[PDB]
Each structure stands twice: as C-alpha cells, then as structure tokens.
Design a protein around this ligand. Structure first.
Ligand SMILES: CC[C@H](NC(=O)c1cc[nH]n1)C(=O)O
Ligand SMILES: CC[C@H](NC(=O)c1cc[nH]n1)C(=O)O
Lengths: 410, 410
C-alpha cells in the first residue's frame, strides 16, 4: 500500500528535555537515575528513579491551561509539540482532516487521582476538581494536542503498559498505510512516580531496591539485576506518507517498514522462559516488513532489568535470528533511562531511528557480569559505531502483550 | 481485502446479565436506572445510575482470581467469555496465534485505585496490594482473557472515553482485514460508580441530578435533559474473517463493513454546535463501507442526554443524510441503559447488530418534548419494527474523539 516515514521527533526523558540532549546522554553512557526529590520516600523500599529534571510547562502551555492537566498529559503535549515543530509541517484547511494523534499512557493521571482522592476522603466529594476527569483520562494528550493544533484526523489512545508507545506508533503507521491519515503524531507519556506508583510496583516486588547506587540499579542481563527502575517522560514521532513527505521536501529520518504483535497467553507479570511470544512478535514484524532475520543489524531491547524478562528476551532473539543472533547488536537503553512504561516504546523508537541516522548502537551500561546464556553482542558499557540498515524496537508488557517496530534507513 | 462478520456477542448491562435479557429490556422500553445501593451517596448531587444487578463473578472466575481484579476487569471478562461461548469457536494450536483481544475501558480501575489510596493515606505504602497494578490497568481485560483462553494474537486496549468500545471494535476489524488476525474479541467495560467517578462527573456538572425520578433522568433530545446518567457494564463481540467463519459453519449475526474516525479539534467536553466532526466521522465510515448515506436505515446515536451534545448530533445527521435524514430511524438506547462510557460503544454495537437481526429500531424512551430542530424519527417511546439493511453506531468522546461503525445484514 503506502509507505510511512518519520519526519519529526520529540522527547522528555531522564537524560534531557529534548531529543538531541537525551541522545547525547545515551551515546555517552550517562545514567538518568537519581534519588527522587519531589516527594519524601524515606518509608519506601525504592527511593530513586528517572525524573524529568527542570521541566518548564510554560514553554508549551499557559499556567491556567497547565494547572488543569496531570503531568503525564503535560509531558505528552511537550514531546508532541517538539515533534510537530521538528517535522516542519504546516497544518492548513487543505490537510487538517488528514492529520491525527495516537498518544498513549500506561497508568495515566495517577498523581491527579491520588491528590483528588486525598480531598475526597478528608473533605468529601465537593472538593474534587471540576477538571479531574478531562485532566486525568489517558486520551486527553490526543484530545488537547488535536485542539491546540487543529488536528481533525483519527484521534485515539492505547494503554498497554510497556507496549503502549510501540502499539501507538504501529497502529498510527497502519492508519497512514490504510489511507485513514497522511500524518499521525504518535507515542506515549508517563508520570507514575507518586505514592501509588512506587508503592504499587514495590508491593509487586517489581522494582530494583539498590538505593545505595541508583545509577547501577538498571543492569539488563547482569547477574545481579533485581527489577526495573521507574522513570517518567514522553516520546512523540511525526509519521507521514512518503509521497506526502517528499512533496513538501520534508527531512526524512528513516522509514517505518514493519509492525508486529503477539500475546504470550502465559502469565500477567512473567514471560515464558523461552520468550516464545516475543519470538512470534519479532517474526510478525519482520514478515510485515518483508525482511529476513539476517537483514537486522540493531535491536533496541525491552531489557527492563528483571530476572525472568531479560533472559526470556535472549532466548527469543536466539530462536528468531539463529546464527545471525551473534552478528547483530542488541542493547537496552533502559540501562541509562530506566523504564518509562507507557513512554518506553516511544523514546526507544526515537533511539532506534537515531541509531540509523548516526550509525551507532547505544550501549547497555552496568553490564558487568552477563548472566548465563547472555553471550550476544549486548553493546556492554560503550556505544559501538557500526553499519545499521535495519533496527528493531521490542516492547513486552504486563499481560504478555508484545509489540515490535522495524525501522530502516530510507 | 478480507470481509469481517460478527459470530458472537456478550454483555453485562443495567438491563441484564447477558445479551438476550438486555435486548428484551431494550425492545420493551425498560429503564435500567435506579438509586445506587452499593455506596452511600446522601452527600452527592447525583445518587442514581445504571448498575449491573446480581453479577456473580464465580460464574466466570474462581474467588481467589476474582479478588485480585477490579470490577471493570470482571465485567470485561464476563462479556468476553459470553461472546466466545456464543461464537462456538474452538481454540486449537492450529488457530490460537490468529485470535486476538481488544477490550478497552474509559476510566479503568477507579474503585481499586480509590481503595488502595485509602490504605496508602491511613497506613502508608506497605498496605498497597501486590496485585494493585496488574488488577487495575486497563489492558488486563485483554491480558487475563488471552491467558484464560490461550489467545496469542494481537493483544491491546483502547481508552477513548465514550468512543472506547467503538475504536476497540473498529481497530479489531482492521487487524482481521489486514491479515494480522482471523478472529478478535473486541469491546469495552466500565465500572466508574465510586466516589471519584460520581464526584468527578458531578464536579464537572456533567450528570443529570433528577434524583426524584431516576428512570426519567436520561432523556436524549428532550428539552428538559440535564446531563448524562453514569452506568456500568461491558460488551464484547467475536469479529471473524468471512471465509474462516463459513469454513466452520459459524452462525453469522451481521457484517461489519465500515469504520470511521475524526477529531473535533474544538473543546474537551463540548462539541461544535453544528457537529462538524461527527459529520466527517459518519462520512468516513460510509466511505470505508462503500455506502451512500441513502442506504442507511438505522442510527444507534451517541445521544447521552446533554444540552450541547444531543442537538450537535441532530445537526451532523441532517448535514450527512440531507432529505434521507427524515427517512432513516435514529434512537439513543442510553434513554434506557444510561451512559456506560468505555462500554457504551460495545453494547451499542450489539444493539445495532440485533436491530439488523430482529428488523426493529429500539426506542428513545423519555422523549416527551423534542427540543428545537429535533424533528427526525427518533423512535420516541416505543420500538419501531421496520426494514433495516444498514445500521450505524456513533460514539463522540471527551477530547472531541469520534468513531462510527457501519453494520450490514449479511
Ligand atoms: C510479561 C511482561 C514482560 N515480558 C517480558 O519481559 C518478556 C521477555 C520475553 N518475552 N516477554 C515481563 O516479563 O515483565
Ligand atoms: C466532545 C464530546 C461529546 N461530543 C458530542 O456529544 C458530539 C455531538 C456531536 N458531535 N460531538 C460531548 O459533547 O459530550
């Protein structure tokens, strides 16, 4: 059908307030993880994570506007505005019906819900903000962005935990391929660092508790890994039909050539040991892209630093790629960023596109002692300049919900 | 490409614990709205809504399983199990990779969040349930259903307020048409009747406050309407590729021939007065279906009983359908069910399919005094037996996010 290319990108991450600042940090192997300052966690088993430092919402919205919206929505609008600016696209009466939005979130407005809950229990239902529902529901990034830029195309929001940003980009690409849109702003945002978030993941024993060295906590495939690090932020891409992009002389970063999905149908928080669902998902993406496994050069892994997850992903890549599994480079940027949950797939799509632009595999930092069977090129410690024609981005979410995107040099 | 048909349906609604019980109530013009019993609302301006009466989760899950899951997930699994049973489909190693799930929710596990919030504020983070995250996140209907039935196909969740169930069914149909699945279980569930829900919508002044006559509160296009009625429940459909359905001699209820989307890009909680976005959305659906407006016989309206919303929908239908707007029948089943939010589009898809099966337009009850310009066949008061070849279902959600499904007799 129609070809889909990336013409714009935007991001808020624990490493930077835009794409170039974040990417510089990635190629330098810098950690974005620090003790959390914005709340007292002295009573929690995990007291660190990946915060956006120095976010100024006034750069994007008025203070009245902003004060109605949970931070996840603010982060999502920031990444979305950056990406549209970056594309150089001009929204007119001639194209506004052909431009949609698919910005998702894993948990949404947990901070707002928590603060309205306080008011409700202390002071009863009349203390709840009139803006509580519209400022908290996950689809209000899509809603607010469409209103602010006059975007009248397909308008929706995915919520698939770690897979959110990957689903959001894949399904936006489907809309453009199908003819439902010529442009889509797609990605995700997350800000789940509130009591209920840290407490909730902590009560599941899902989080690293390495409070003494937060920068060493996220260590994907390392034998001393002890759970993921919770991080905040946002990613947005401008996806565009190829002839549309060429016609306005847009700068094309890369092509989005494949999108795959699968379900494990195994467990809610644990993968099959052999990562069978992840293998089906990657194969589905490669088949959608018309690619053979041997054509893959770089994988931006799910690699969240969990005991069961990290090794299941190695098993899946070995199953899919056979002997080529030792030729390709695979890295987890979560070594540096931690796990941005609903934003993870968006920021990792951007890192996959920039790997193609800069011909460099970002490192897996903290990979001091690779665990049994973790004997691939995991780009340990330092970035590796190398040939990259094809980059995959994997997301394996709670519920066993899997998604894989395939990018290619244009 | 490939044709998509409905072979199974399931539902929990304020009118019944399955499809036939709910549908009987619809054709009889019965109200599902009553004073809310499960919590004390003596301090709220709205004290009524559409509850599921006599839900027995043990019919579907073990009590240990159930006790880990927010009610929205229980309602979603109930409708999903009913629909798969209803389809007669047998899941095997030969097809489990070709069967996915797209079950969405508007608000998700607000009840669980509220009850974990209580524990957090009273007793600090260690009182939070270990199952808080996996039992509360919107994608766990898709997750749990896939695990319970061994479904390994595309696995995801939409969250688009009133449009959730419509997006969920439309995008599942896209997956089957595209070749990503041969079967999808799609729909939505909602249980937002907790303090934060009623308080939240009340603080926005969004809800009817007709506490003295709850059964008369939901009165779409009536001049004395004063906001929507909050309702709970679930809808699921089994969508299936036509040759797949025929090959196993499945009973085919109807064909899903069109899916349209648009954004208003106007306001978060108010439509354009002329319903321009709703008009684009309906036209997109008809174009996707290869249908002319004159071929539409029945519209299952959004029609939530709001001042600005109900008349904007009339304006949109008059714009799209011209003189044929006076020939077609349009009704709001929310007159009877109230607004099930993330489940609204799923249960209204089922009512649209049953309108085709039974050749009957469900009524708009409580339409005593149609407002200025509301001069269409709104099937006031009583069901109207009539010829229905083509049925549309409209959903217009917070954020100005619009979706329309087009069903046709097979
Ligand atoms: C089930 C969700 C998630 N899944 C994975 O990590 C994974 C690894 C290989 N296949 N799936 C998790 O284990 O946290
Ligand atoms: C904006 C959401 C929703 N929209 C509508 O009712 C509507 C009616 C015609 N076009 N849109 C609402 O007004 O509550």
């Amino acid at each position: 059908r129609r070809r889909v290319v990336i013409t714009g990108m935007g991001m808020l991450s624990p490493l930077g307030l835009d794409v170039p600042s974040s990417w510089e940090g990635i190629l330098a192997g810098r950690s974005g993880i620090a003790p959390i300052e914005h709340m007292d966690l002295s009573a929690y088993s995990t007291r660190f994570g990946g915060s956006v430092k120095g976010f100024n919402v006034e750069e994007y919205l008025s203070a009245k506007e902003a004060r109605k919206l949970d931070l996840f929505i603010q982060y999502g609008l920031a990444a979305s505005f950056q990406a549209v600016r970056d594309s150089g696209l001009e929204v007119t009466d001639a194209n506004r019906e052909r431009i949609g939005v698919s910005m998702g979130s894993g948990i949404g407005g947990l901070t707002n819900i928590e603060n309205n809950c306080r008011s409700l229990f202390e002071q009863g239902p009349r203390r709840i903000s009139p803006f509580f529902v519209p400022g908290s529901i996950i689809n209000m990034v899509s809603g607010f962005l469409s209103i602010h830029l006059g975007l009248q195309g397909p308008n929706y929001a995915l919520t698939t935990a770690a897979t959110t940003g990957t689903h959001s980009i894949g399904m936006a690409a489907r809309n453009i391929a199908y003819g439902e849109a010529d442009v889509m702003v797609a990605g995700g945002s997350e800000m789940a660092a509130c009591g209920l978030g840290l407490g909730g993941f902590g009560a599941a024993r899902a989080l690293s508790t390495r409070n003494d060295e937060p920068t060493r906590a996220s260590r994907p495939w390392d034998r001393d890994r002890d759970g993921f690090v919770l991080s905040d932020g946002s990613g947005a891409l401008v996806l565009e039909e190829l002839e549309h992009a060429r016609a306005r002389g847009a700068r094309i970063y890369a092509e989005l050539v494949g999108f795959g999905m699968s379900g494990d149908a195994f467990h809610m928080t644990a993968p099959p040991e052999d990562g069978a669902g992840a293998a089906r998902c990657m194969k589905n993406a490669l088949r959608d892209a018309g690619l053979d496994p041997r054509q893959v050069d770089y994988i931006n892994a799910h690699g969240t630093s969990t005991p069961a997850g990290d090794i299941a992903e190695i098993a899946a890549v070995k199953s899919v790629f056979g002997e080529h599994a030792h030729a390709l480079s695979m890295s987890s940027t979560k070594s540096m960023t931690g796990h941005l949950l609903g934003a993870a797939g968006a920021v990792e799509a951007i890192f996959s596109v920039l790997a193609l632009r800069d011909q460099v595999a970002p490192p897996t930092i903290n990979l001091d002692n690779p665990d049994e069977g973790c004997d691939l090129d995991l780009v340990a410690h330092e970035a590796k300049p190398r040939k990259i024609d094809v980059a995959l981005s994997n997301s394996f979410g709670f519920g066993g919900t899997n998604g894989t995107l395939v990018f290619r040099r244009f």
